């Protein structure tokens, strides 16, 4: 479908594993907000959008419908489970690297299905969690997902990183390396 | 490997030329298989696979559900676009342009929004296209993009290479030069 702008109002996901759901709105492929279902709280992902109001109850109601539909479909499909795809992992910096100027490492995990994944960061062989954050699962037109993880850092010759990705479609945790 | 059963519901709007042309497609998706959708161009639910046939049949038989779906293009899509006009569609972030050799010259254009951008390489006064390859748009996930545009060159004496960048956030092109 050709269009100047595409939006999802919203992307509703529910899956048996967990189980767990996710409610987001996307505009032109970027996440506007997500509803934290457990806390019943809307979380805006772009500052200018904080002036808006979206009642988390609306998302709870939709996710409840999905849960009911999923269970209807499992049986009718003769318990056809999700196929595990091989995700593709790419690691890059937000801006050109100059040593001693703050930057962000970005780990793009694409072609994710099913949407269950562990993305971690290793700083010199050991796991780190400070300065780490990530997007929700973002939708794609083939109905798989992508997710992006971030690591804030100060580039230096003496430090290298790996993005570590765990997913059922992989034989072993995939490790993507980065150096300045 | 544990099994997962996945359900997705996407409420999508496709905008062309503002809200002059708006198409709504809601998609119900089992695992990765779209099974039913409502396309405002068609005006009723249509099953996509046998799995979604009883849903479509059932949903279509409810005249009130149908009337609500038919009005959703105005109630949801055109309504939310008015919010986008004040926010997402006004967002302007200016690209940074940097030239670095990897022979192969790389022009990095980082941290811009929106997506519409044009990067050109020039050798002296003439555009290079034969020996140019650009990454696709790279989505940073935080409402900025970057793109890498690469030039294969055989630098002769006195050659001046120019990376030329046009983007809606600039009144004039950004130009950065490089000499062997």
């Amino acid at each position: 479908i050709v269009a100047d702008h595409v939006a999802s109002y919203g992307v509703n996901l529910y899956q048996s594993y967990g189980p767990s759901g996710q409610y987001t709105h996307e505009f032109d492929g970027d996440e506007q907000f997500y509803v934290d279902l457990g806390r019943k709280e809307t979380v805006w992902c772009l500052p200018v959008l904080r002036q808006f109001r979206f009642d988390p109850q609306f998302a709870l109601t939709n996710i409840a419908v999905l849960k009911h539909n999923l269970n209807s479909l499992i049986k009718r499909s003769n318990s056809t489970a999700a196929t595990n795809e091989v995700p593709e992992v790419t690691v890059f910096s937000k801006s050109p690297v100059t040593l001693g100027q703050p930057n962000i490492l970005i780990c793009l995990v694409d072609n994710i299905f099913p949407p269950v994944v562990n993305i971690t960061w290793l700083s010199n062989g050991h796991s780190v969690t400070e300065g780490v954050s990530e997007t929700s699962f973002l939708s794609k037109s083939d109905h798989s997902f992508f997710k992006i993880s971030y690591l804030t850092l100060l580039p230096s010759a003496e430090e290298s990183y790996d993005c570590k990705v765990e997913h059922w479609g992989l034989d072993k945790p995939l490790l993507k390396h980065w150096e300045p | 490997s544990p099994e997962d059963f996945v359900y997705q519901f996407k409420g999508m709007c496709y905008f062309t030329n503002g809200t002059e042309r708006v198409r709504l497609v809601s998609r119900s998706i089992y695992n990765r298989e779209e099974i039913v959708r409502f396309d405002s161009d068609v005006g009723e639910f249509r099953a996509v696979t046998l799995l979604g046939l009883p849903a479509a049949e059932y949903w279509n038989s409810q005249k009130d559900i149908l009337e609500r779906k038919r009005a959703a293009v105005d109630r949801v899509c055109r309504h939310n676009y008015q919010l986008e006009l004040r926010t997402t569609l006004q967002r302007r972030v200016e690209p940074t342009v940097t030239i670095s050799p990897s022979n192969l010259l790389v022009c990095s254009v980082t941290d811009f929004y929106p997506a519409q951008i044009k990067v050109r390489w020039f050798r002296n006064d003439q555009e290079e296209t034969a020996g140019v390859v650009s990454t696709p748009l790279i989505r940073n996930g935080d409402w900025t993009f970057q793109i890498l545009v690469m030039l294969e060159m055989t630098p002769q004496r006195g050659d001046v290479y120019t990376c030329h960048v046009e983007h809606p956030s600039l009144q004039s092109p950004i130009t950065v030069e490089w000499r062997a």
Binding site: G10, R53, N62, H68, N69, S72, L73 | R75, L83
Partner: peptide, 12 residues
């Protein structure tokens, strides 16, 4: 409005 609307999922 300062209120985004959403499309409602329907029960099967």
């Amino acid at each position: 409005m300062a209120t985004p609307l959403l499309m409602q999922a329907l029960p099967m």
